[PDB]
Homo-oligomer: A and B are copies of this chain.
Amino acid sequence: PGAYD
């Protein structure tokens, strides 16, 4: 995933 952020 990845933080938005």
> Which chain A residues have a beta carbon within 8 Å of chain B's beta carbons?
1-3
Contact = CB atoms under 8 A, between A and B. Distances in A.
Q: Is the interface of A mostly helix, strand, loop or mixed?
A: strand
A3 B1 CA distance: 9
A1 to B, nearest CB: 6
Nearest to A3: B3
Nearest to A2: B1
Nearest to A1: B2
A2 B3 CA distance: 7
Closest 3 CB pairs of A and B: A3-B3, A1-B2, A2-B2
Contacts of A3: 3
A3 B2 CA distance: 7
